[PDB]
């Protein structure tokens, strides 16, 4: 409870502390239950997620991560603060939790169960700083207006599917297939087609922010025969295989870097089986990388059409 007291007209400011109030009015004050809504429960490492919640009685907020220790701040913004609207609601969508410089990001970058909390920016600092403090202990985080939730970061998952007409492909001159699937946690996906004769083709697909990818009208410019397609996605390390390809850069080997290695496989005298074995040994089995692939096979047959059965609208097949 808190009261406002009016004083007699004409009284001075300094002298008014002594005399009794002519009248007064009282009112009650209650705290604001700031809390988070979006990040809770399951989460996929490396995946961009939205952040939203309510921050009643606050103007700016900060987000901290905890695992059996102090709360570490995340460098979500330049000022490390999120403004609060007139509706006591804050939101900062499409942020990569695992892609930040702070130690909380590194903690969230490894699979496991952790805690994520929100605190008031005004209560965030503990030394008169004009910005959010980097680290706060349990007592400091609990004392101020704050809330916490349990989070559980898990490994990435990859799935895919090809649109085979009959298990084969459109005419060899313009063979066309489509791909779809889910690649949550990644930013780009690669697809490669290898024939039995050692010719290779590749294509890069930008996965949507929700983790679902769907590409249509992909041209397979290979020779007629058995052709194996592989779909590749980089793991947490964002490097293919060991990250040290036998050719080109030896560090930070991305899919675009792997295209350079692919460009040399076809020129060699290797066949389809040898190319498949080399790519499986280098991309996946090398140093037990976290990158994930899926496989499919199809025959690039020539156009063909035939009639199977003819019958009246009766019981016949």
């Amino acid at each position: 409870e808190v009261d406002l007291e009016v004083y007699d007209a004409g009284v001075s400011a300094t002298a008014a502390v002594g005399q009794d109030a002519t009248n007064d009015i009282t009112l009650t004050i209650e705290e604001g239950g700031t809390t988070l809504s979006s990040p809770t429960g399951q989460y996929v490492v490396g995946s961009e997620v939205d952040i939203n919640g309510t921050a009643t009685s606050s103007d700016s907020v900060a987000i901290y991560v905890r695992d059996d220790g102090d709360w570490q701040l995340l460098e979500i913004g330049g000022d490390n603060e999120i403004s609060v609207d007139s509706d006591d609601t804050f939101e900062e969508e499409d942020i990569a939790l695992s892609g930040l410089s702070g130690d909380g990001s590194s903690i969230l970058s490894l699979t496991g169960t952790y805690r994520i909390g929100v605190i008031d920016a005004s209560d965030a600092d503990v030394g008169g700083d004009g910005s959010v403090d980097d680290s706060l202990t349990t007592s400091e985080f609990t004392s101020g207006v704050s809330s916490s939730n349990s989070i559980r970061v898990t490994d990435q998952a990859l799935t895919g599917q090809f649109t085979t007409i009959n298990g084969q492909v459109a005419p060899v001159e313009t063979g066309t297939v489509d791909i779809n699937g889910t690649a949550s946690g990644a930013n780009s996906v690669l697809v490669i087609f290898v024939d039995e004769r050692g010719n290779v083709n590749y294509q890069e697909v930008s996965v949507d922010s929700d983790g679902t990818y769907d590409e249509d009208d992909i041209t397979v410019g290979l020779t007629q025969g058995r052709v194996t397609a592989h779909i590749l996605s980089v793991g947490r390390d964002s490097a293919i295989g060991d990250g040290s390809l036998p050719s080109g850069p030896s560090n930070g080997a991305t899919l675009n870097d792997l295209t350079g290695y692919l460009d040399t496989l076809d020129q060699n005298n290797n066949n389809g089986e040898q190319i498949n074995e080399l790519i499986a040994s280098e991309t996946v089995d090398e140093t037990a990388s976290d990158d994930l692939i899926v496989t499919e096979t199809f025959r690039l047959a020539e156009s063909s059409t035939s009639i199977d059965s003819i019958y009246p609208d009766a019981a016949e097949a």
Partner: protein, 318 residues
């Protein structure tokens, strides 16, 4: 100083000098100038002739007793004396704009975008009384001293459209205040606050809302152009409406792609673009139908919404 209030930084001046204009409703001082030398004046020509004027008393705010014109000491006589030209107070125009430019008066603006709002106005009576701005919340309480931003409460005449506090206008901030309708009242410093001498503009502070795209229909056949509407954007700003080239028919050439969007209505420009280059309707040196990535229309929203259109030909039946 009469005529030039900025000479002594005064908000007003009531020391009339021979020949200087005088507006309706002024309470002329009688201590200097014509206020003491010639307190009584007579009209010269037109409807003014015969009619008298007294500087020792406030001038009526209506023309029914003080017709507009030139007033002399001799009136209709051939003698030319210290004269007074009577006019009417009037605010020609007023606007509320953003520091980047663009009128936002009466519209809905988010709290974050109201950081550096400016109020400008052009009026008639700058030679006598500076105009003054009062900001009131939805409940009508004065909040001028709480939202004032680094400037006084006096708007200079002219300088309409100014987006900086260097000259003219008054800078205000509305980020701190909550959502609602706020009234900005411009009125004379002392006396000229009646009729055309005052104005009441409105501003709508709202929560940050997403840019809403709407179509007049959902299921349409090919060849039937469809109009789309963009809403909840900042007035006088440019948005980009994009179409994925995957939905475009494969057999379509560059020209078909470069005409998916029309130049109808508020649309400012139409073309195609990729991550590196663009081909507009006025050129062909940009990306081809395969080289480009998407089709795009740059639209400049005016008011609260913008309207554009699309031709649904050369599009897949999905």
């Amino acid at each position: 100083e009469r005529g030039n209030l900025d000479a002594d930084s005064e908000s007003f001046n009531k020391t009339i000098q021979s020949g200087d204009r005088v507006f309706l409703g002024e309470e002329i001082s009688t201590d200097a100038g014509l206020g003491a030398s010639n307190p009584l004046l007579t009209g010269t020509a037109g409807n003014s002739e015969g009619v008298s004027l007294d500087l020792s008393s406030p001038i009526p705010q209506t023309t029914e007793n003080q017709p507009l014109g030139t007033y002399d000491v001799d009136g209709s006589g051939s003698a030319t004396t210290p004269n007074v030209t009577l006019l009417a107070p009037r605010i020609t125009d007023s606007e509320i704009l953003t520091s980047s430019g663009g009128d936002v008066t009466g519209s809905a603006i988010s709290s974050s975008d109201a950081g550096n709002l400016y109020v400008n106005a052009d009026y008639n009576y700058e030679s006598a009384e500076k105009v003054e701005v009062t900001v009131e919340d939805p409940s009508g309480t004065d909040i001028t001293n709480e939202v004032l931003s680094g400037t006084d409460t006096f708007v200079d005449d002219g300088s309409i459209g100014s987006t900086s506090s260097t000259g003219g206008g008054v800078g205000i901030d509305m980020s701190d205040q909550d959502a609602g309708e706020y009234t900005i009242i411009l009125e004379g410093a002392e006396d000229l606050d009646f009729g055309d001498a005052t104005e009441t503009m409105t501003l709508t502070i709202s929560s940050q809302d997403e840019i809403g795209i709407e179509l007049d229909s959902e299921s349409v056949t090919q060849g039937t152009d469809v109009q789309y509407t963009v809403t909840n954007g900042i007035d006088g700003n440019e948005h980009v409406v994009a179409m994925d080239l995957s939905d475009l028919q494969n057999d379509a050439t560059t020209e078909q792609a470069k005409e998916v969007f029309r130049n109808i209505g508020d649309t400012s420009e139409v073309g195609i673009a990729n991550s590196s280059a663009t081909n507009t309707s006025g050129s062909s040196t940009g990306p081809t139908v395969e080289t480009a990535d998407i089709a795009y229309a740059v639209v400049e929203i005016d008011g609260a919404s913008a309207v554009g259109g699309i031709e649904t030909q050369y599009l897949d039946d999905s």
